[PDB]
Design a protein around this ligand. Structure first.
Ligand SMILES: Cc1cn([C@H]2C[C@H](O)[C@@H](COP(=O)(O)OP(=O)(O)OP(=O)(O)O)O2)c(=O)[nH]c1=O
Ligand SMILES: Nc1nc2c(ncn2[C@H]2C[C@H](O)[C@@H](COP(=O)(O)OP(=O)(O)O)O2)c(=O)[nH]1
Ligand SMILES: Nc1nc2c(ncn2[C@H]2C[C@H](O)[C@@H](COP(=O)(O)OP(=O)(O)O)O2)c(=O)[nH]1
Ligand SMILES: [Mg+2]
Ligand SMILES: [Mg+2]
Ligand SMILES: [Mn+2]
Ligand SMILES: [Mn+2]
Ligand SMILES: [Mn+2]
Ligand SMILES: [Mn+2]
Lengths: 289, 683, 289, 683
């Protein structure tokens, strides 16, 4: 009942980072403190890693196991967006704002950062555990994918949105909003596929799947807290970002058909402001009048 | 923002559900009193002005020296006595931006409208004070408008030629191709548009002195001409404009058309060269019967018969060419070629379509030659003879290359003044003077044909404006009735003026005695058929103005037979692009494209309502795209029967209609006697 | 040396089925004979069936085994074009020209057809034989992929191009030309990835891989000749189609860095109509001798 | 695979560690016996063959009628008395594929080598049987090779012109530019390469009769000429080749060079138009001192001084141009321009470099004009006068456009026959005959200069072959010693033959009296310096041959003063591209590019060892790229001091060579007196 409308929405949302000129951010970037620039680079690098794996691994593997040519076409399109559009856009931003050495250093930093490695290990592990014709392993990977789309990106998205909302780094911010617009529909779509599998189960099996989903969310959440503190303490925003990730965790649960898990909190209003002619043959009668 | 363009933009602000059309009067008033009177150089007396203009190389001393300064003063008083006021901002803006004389640094304004008109009139009269006053009255009343070259350059020292349309016949030789390139660059340097006939050129894969598959075809010459026109671009302000014409039975016709395809390669596509296709009735007959047509190699026909293919009658020699084994021919599908023509016109507006048998069945000078191609504007239809440019040491055989001086009657102002006869005769005199004072010293055939044929083109504009301001729909039969009567009267008075000029000067155009005017066959439909209006509404439009009857046409026929005709061709209806704004008139006899025309000049946006547009005649100003092209074809064919040359006929197509609809319009135009089709404009 | 350049060319060629209005083809379709309509339907179904294998297996399997983030992104983009763009385009052409029952029957026929099946299963067999961390098996699959993209499609493309060059079925012919333009670049790109593997091999292993490629080409070519006669004899075109197959076989070989196998031949003109050393400054004393 | 192709391919098969060089004799023998003797049309008698050739439009009856058939039979006897054998397969293949007369369907062979040589000799002698026999002996001994046009076309009815190098001056006017395009197409039609001097054309952004910034510059003319040469493609046989020359002080020099960049825009890039840059000593002096230089707008200089910028001496006029406020200029960096030249030559081999003051410091006809530019092959250096092509009705002012006739001495065969004097004099006579019999009807300046100047070009070839077959390294001082002596003798005997022809005809070339020959200034270095060999080995090479001494040169100077000089120009060393294979000779005076030449003809690959290559002389056949370009410059400058025109000097560069190395080679060539630099060939 939904794939065709998602197909149409995904293809109509198609974009490339080159559509957005980035040289306009040069001055507001220059004006940020060293702490702010550091957090910003690292935040986008963490996002780049997530999209790299979502494009290389997550979306293609889910596409492989989901039945139906139209469902596969949507998932293939989403996969392309992840690595050919989203992951690449971050390099466009980096290449504009930062010198090569700072770019090299931040990519080295992703490799050695323990929270980023842990979250990649956990998510990709679940993708690679999918067994052919085994719907339960597929469900588990789809939960992981929804958590990546609708929860994990948001510790990263906070900062570009926070600046956009203050009228700073607005070209980079425009790119990020386009990425976010895509991930929102990706999270909903994968959520609907996960619910399909969940709804086939016995009540006992469903109870176990909810346990899996909640245990996984809590494990990812605890790691994300440490990641958030590590990045945002130097810019004074860790508590604010934490509220934002809890907000989005609830959206991820809802995408999976589950009740919200965290209590509602006031999000920084700045971040909320951050959101030929046809050829017809001649007839014989055309020559007489 | 300028005050005048701010006032001009208040037209579109709809007050009480209506466009504020009166803002354009305020717009032009503000334009004058805030830009023009400020930037106008004013002298203490006209004598100081004329001395300043002559001394600083702005005017020509020779033509101003034929009048005593009292006569020039009287002429200027006659111009300023009218107290002409531009009715719209666009009229004055176009005049003072395109035709008004400016200082050498393009800083201030030297000529007003009256000054330019007086200078043009003194140039036309050639020493006659009363004739100069008559020309001043004619142009200040805006009954007649000289073409852009004449109106822009009449009496100016550093000027281009007064003629801008030239037609060249290219012979099948490298010497003739080199001379064609040279003459094209020379005429483009003068500012004129050059049309070339490429039908005599042998096709691709023909022999050059017994080595076969050696000729590059007409497309190589097309590339040569395209680069020649790109080179001669006159600063690039108006880049060199050329047109190439090919007979549809030329073997290179498909490659000729492929130069305009969007997917054409850079080694084939031509950009600055318009293309026209000459279609004999034989091709239309072959396509109608769905038979297999043949395109021919021109050099084989020339070798076998001693004449060029386009110099022969295809309707009588096509079967002989097909049956001749020594003639080389290629099989084509005529309906496929027609569909390709329609597709190319839909996608690019090209080629121009000339219906050769429609031109030549009424052509008055077939004894001199048949019309084989049209001009860049696709309305000049005159006999031409190809030149034979030989080696450097040898003498050249100079033929006849077409060129005519353009001039438009303003139908609205002529009809308001009830002055068809006087306007037509004075315009004929002015065009004759422009022909006589033109001397192209680098195009020998153009010069020879200008001296011999003495051809002029007297067009008309504001047909749709006059009809819409008189409550007549363009597609209505009453409009065609008015056009019939008006253009029959214009033809009558142009023939009368030509005969009177021949009687006064004692000379006719070269080879007049073989023309249909001399034999009297031209006047058959005029001495047999009455062209008085058939509707009482139209008949009142001509009240107070004598309409020649069959007896008047018989008297004129006797007068022509006893005195001859001075001009081989007299009437041609050109597009009249930019002078239509100055005259506050609709362009040519074609219907309007937009009721209110929006344009951007520099970083300023301005709107031009059609002349006389209001709420009482809003729906009579029907846009050309919304009307039936069959009725427009009917109107143009009604006008064409009184025009000796062609009419620049633009086809206005909607996006919905297919190539079949364009082909149907073309075939109906051919059926109705349309001589040429200019453009396939799509909205 | 090449992936970013191909990325650029791929993304700038992006298009969607909806851009070409198909209905105006019915004005020439109605004038074709039964044999012409039959051949067209069968050719179209052949292309559709082969392209589906490439979208579901061929491109995604190669993307899975190739190392490099940028290569995976380009390959993902190509897989997207197969599934989201090409497959929808073929379906659109079919739905325009034939009623539902006729489409189902043509696909039933072509699905059972011996020559279509032989080539489809030969290609799919090589994709299924790729082994993790075995570059030889990957190379063999890449050869199969290049043969599909740059060679096997062309016995099919011939007919739409033949009509397109005559002014018939122009809307569907425009679509086919866009598809073909994508397959051409796909073939060139996968060819470069195969040459990279080939160049890492010993001389004996290279000779062995060359023998594999030529042997595979021979098997496919002999089946193409039979496929061609089966479809095109009824419309009298087989001789010219065979020339077009060999010409495209040579292009496929050149994509794999191999010499042409077949002598040069001219192609049907209707189908054709359808189709710094080192700057160093002068430092003085170079003007004196 | 043909048997001769297999045998020729066995050269690369190394037997006993050496190439099988003897297989090429087997290859040529098999080629003849299996293909040539089978495909050679044979006639019962020579009379039947001659009658068939004249009556079937293969030969010209005019030149053959000058002899009784007995004389022609004896000439053919003399040609066949030598029993000439092609030493290599490539010699016979090149002759019978490029120069041998074939049937109209190109199926059989009418002419053998002896028949072609006999016909060329009979055409040269112009009715003299003994002279024809002398020419037969000269050519069958392969001491003298007429150029490809002369050798291929002499005595043929359907022939091109015997001259293929033309040099046109283009005046700064649209009439002259159109005439230049016409003449370029006419000469390219004849099959000749055309060189155009664009230095007189005013730069981009210059005024055209009070309209400032209206000229497209030399690049618009470059595009026109490129399309003209593309169209005039020699009947689709061989691509039309043309050259454009611009002074380095021309304002458009950077635009001129940008037409050859790989990244050039399609509206700037020219494809079939080679470019050459003329560099006066002033530019090299400015670059040497790193002073910022000025390029000048030519029309400002012409308006200020009444003379063209390239008509004036830049060494004296540069400071006056710079200090003149009415002369327009822009600053350039001459060193950056030199680096751009070197980069362009590395990338594409263009432009040709002509050192203006190196040419004109030894030019013998500076009174007529300075040498302003060279030909398409960069060896023709003659005085030219620009023509003033006026309007069609007016009379043109015809100048002098350069066109010289080419011939090549075979240094190896001339040296082995000890016949420098006889070969030089007979070659001079043949070149004079070709000059007199050449009449071009569409290039008036070329025809006038051919009639007046009577300039010929007598080149040399097989220098490296002769040296390597005599155990002399090309870069060795002994090689330069031999070149000095040999070309001094060639110059001596060419001057002597020219003065003898002047005495016989009683006429010199036009404006000879102002030349350095008339004043004796030409002979100063010859009556003051001895040019006998300085090495015993080289002096032994000239044994049995009188080397002209200082007294002989004084006698020649007196003879020239008494009787005058018939040819303004006599010696120019052309590349001699395809005739070198037929003569079994190394191309021109250049060193060999490769020891064994690998080429593919059809689907079969062929191998061509350099003539005389063996095991003993393998390392004397050093490849040009392995050579020191400074020593090659030294050799060419040694030869250049005895050649009145230039030498086609190709630079052979390695891939490792930088822009600085190419610039150093160019500057050392300028320092050593090199007149022109042809090509930058990179390995
Ligand atoms: C010289 C030349 C001619 N042509 C074409 C253009 C001309 O229309 C046509 C005639 O060339 P001509 O200049 O008339 O050549 P020609 O007189 O020697 O040959 P012929 O005896 O047949 O008249 O040949 C080329 O296409 N390329 C060329 O290079
Ligand atoms: N004074 C003046 N008159 C001009 C100029 N341009 C055109 N005219 C026209 C206006 C009049 O119709 C005519 C005579 O003007 P004038 O020479 O001032 O004469 P007058 O007003 O003393 O009779 O010339 C102009 O620049 N100055
Ligand atoms: N017979 C013959 N001779 C040819 C031909 N082409 C060139 N020649 C040369 C060979 C001789 O040197 C010369 C005379 O040949 P011939 O007419 O047979 O003379 P002869 O030996 O009978 O007196 O012409 C040719 O085609 N046939
Ligand atoms: Mg001719
Ligand atoms: Mg001039
Ligand atoms: Mn993403
Ligand atoms: Mn996503
Ligand atoms: Mn596909
Ligand atoms: Mn593909």
């Amino acid at each position: 009942d939904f794939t065709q409308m998602f197909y149409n929405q995904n293809v109509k949302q198609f974009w490339l980072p080159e559509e957005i000129a980035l040289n306009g951010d040069l001055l507001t970037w220059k004006y940020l403190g060293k702490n702010e620039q550091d957090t910003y680079m690292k935040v986008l690098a963490g996002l780049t890693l997530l999209d790299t794996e979502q494009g290389n691994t997550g979306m293609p593997i889910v596409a492989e196991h989901v039945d139906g040519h139209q469902r596969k076409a949507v998932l293939n399109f989403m996969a392309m967006m992840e690595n050919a559009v989203h992951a690449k856009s971050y390099s466009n931003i980096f290449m504009t704002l930062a010198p090569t050495e700072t770019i090299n250093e931040v990519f080295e930093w992703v490799k050695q950062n323990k929270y980023l490695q842990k979250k990649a290990q956990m998510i990709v592990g679940l993708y690679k555990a999918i067994q052919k014709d085994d719907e339960i392993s597929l469900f588990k990977a789809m939960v992981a994918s929804v958590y990546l789309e609708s929860f994990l990106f948001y510790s990263g998205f906070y900062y570009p949105l926070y600046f956009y909302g203050q009228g700073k780094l607005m070209q980079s911010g425009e790119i990020i909003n386009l990425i976010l617009r895509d991930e929102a529909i990706h999270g909903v779509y994968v959520g609907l596929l996960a619910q399909e599998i969940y709804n086939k189960q016995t009540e006992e099996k469903k109870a176990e799947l909810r346990e899996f989903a909640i245990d996984l969310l809590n494990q990812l959440y605890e790691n994300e807290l440490e990641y958030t503190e590590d990045l945002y303490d130097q810019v004074g925003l860790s508590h604010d970002v934490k509220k934002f990730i809890r907000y989005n965790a609830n959206k991820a649960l809802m995408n999976l058909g589950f009740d919200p898990y965290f209590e509602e909190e006031d999000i920084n209003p700045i971040v909320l402001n951050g959101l030929k002619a046809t050829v017809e043959p001649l007839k014989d009668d055309d020559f007489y009048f | 923002v300028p005050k005048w363009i701010q006032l001009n933009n208040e037209i579109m602000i709809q007050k009480d559900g209506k466009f504020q059309f009166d803002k354009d009067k305020e717009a032009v008033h503000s334009y004058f009193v805030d830009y023009i009177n400020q930037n106008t150089v004013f002298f203490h007396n006209l004598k100081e002005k004329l001395d300043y203009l002559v001394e600083n190389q702005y005017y020509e001393e020779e033509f101003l020296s034929l009048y005593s300064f009292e006569d020039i003063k009287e002429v200027f008083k006659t111009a300023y006595a009218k107290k002409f006021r531009f009715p719209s901002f666009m009229s004055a803006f176009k005049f003072y931006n395109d035709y008004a004389l400016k200082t050498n640094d393009k800083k201030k304004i030297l000529e007003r409208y009256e000054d330019r008109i007086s200078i043009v009139a003194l140039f036309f009269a050639n020493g006659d004070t009363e004739k100069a006053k008559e020309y001043v009255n004619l142009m200040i009343n805006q009954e007649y408008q000289p073409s852009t070259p004449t109106f822009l350059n009449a009496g100016r020292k550093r000027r281009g030629e007064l003629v801008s349309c030239f037609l060249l016949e290219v012979n099948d030789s490298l010497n003739d191709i080199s001379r064609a390139i040279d003459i094209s660059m020379q005429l483009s340097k003068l500012g004129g548009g050059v049309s070339l006939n490429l039908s005599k050129l042998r096709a691709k894969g023909e022999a050059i002195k017994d080595v076969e598959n050696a000729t590059k075809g007409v497309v190589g010459v097309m590339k040569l001409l395209d680069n020649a026109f790109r080179y001669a671009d006159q600063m690039g302000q108006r880049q060199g404009s050329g047109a190439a014409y090919l007979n549809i039975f030329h073997r290179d016709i498909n490659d000729f058309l492929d130069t305009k395809k969007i997917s054409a390669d850079e080694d084939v596509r031509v950009k600055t060269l318009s293309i026209g296709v000459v279609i004999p009735d034989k091709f239309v007959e072959l396509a109608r019967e769905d038979k297999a047509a043949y395109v021919f190699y021109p050099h084989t026909i020339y070798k076998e018969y001693g004449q060029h293919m386009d110099e022969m009658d295809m309707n009588e020699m096509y079967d002989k060419f097909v049956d001749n084994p020594r003639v080389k021919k290629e099989k084509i599908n005529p309906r496929k070629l027609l569909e390709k023509l329609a597709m190319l016109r839909s996608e690019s507006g090209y080629p121009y379509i000339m219906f050769q048998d429609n031109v030549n069945k009424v052509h008055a000078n077939n004894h001199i030659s048949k019309v084989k191609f049209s001009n860049l504007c696709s309305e000049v239809l005159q006999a031409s003879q190809v030149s034979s440019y030989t080696d450097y040491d040898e003498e050249d055989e100079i033929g006849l290359d077409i060129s005519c001086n353009l001039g438009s009657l303003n139908i609205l102002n002529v009809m308001e003044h009830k002055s068809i006869e006087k306007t037509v005769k004075l315009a004929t005199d002015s065009l004759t003077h422009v022909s006589e004072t033109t001397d192209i010293r680098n195009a020998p055939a153009v010069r020879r044909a200008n001296k011999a044929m003495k051809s002029i083109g007297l067009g008309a504009m504001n047909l749709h404006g006059y009809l819409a301001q008189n409550g007549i729909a363009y597609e209505s039969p009453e409009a065609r009735d008015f056009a019939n009567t008006f253009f029959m009267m214009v033809n009558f008075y142009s023939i009368q003026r030509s005969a009177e000029i021949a009687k006064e000067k004692g000379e006719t155009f070269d080879q007049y005695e073989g023309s249909t005017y001399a034999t009297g066959e031209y006047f058959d439909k005029y001495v047999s058929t009455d062209f008085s209006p058939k509707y009482e509404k139209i008949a009142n439009l001509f009240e107070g103005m004598h309409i020649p009857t069959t007896e008047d046409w018989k008297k004129l026929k006797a007068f022509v037979a006893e005195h001859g005709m001075y001009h081989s061709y007299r009437l041609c209806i050109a597009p009249t692009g930019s002078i239509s704004y100055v005259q506050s008139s609709t362009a040519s006899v074609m219907p309007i494209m937009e009721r209110i025309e929006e344009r951007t000049y520099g970083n300023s946006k301005t709107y031009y309502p059609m002349p006389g547009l209001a709420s009482n005649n809003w729906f009579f100003y029907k846009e050309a795209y919304d009307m039936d092209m069959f009725k427009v074809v009917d109107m143009i064919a009604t006008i064409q029967q009184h025009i000796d040359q062609g009419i620049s006929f633009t086809l206005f197509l909607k996006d919905t209609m297919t190539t079949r609809d364009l082909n149907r319009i073309d075939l109906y135009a051919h059926h109705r006697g349309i001589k040429t089709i200019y453009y396939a404009r799509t909205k």
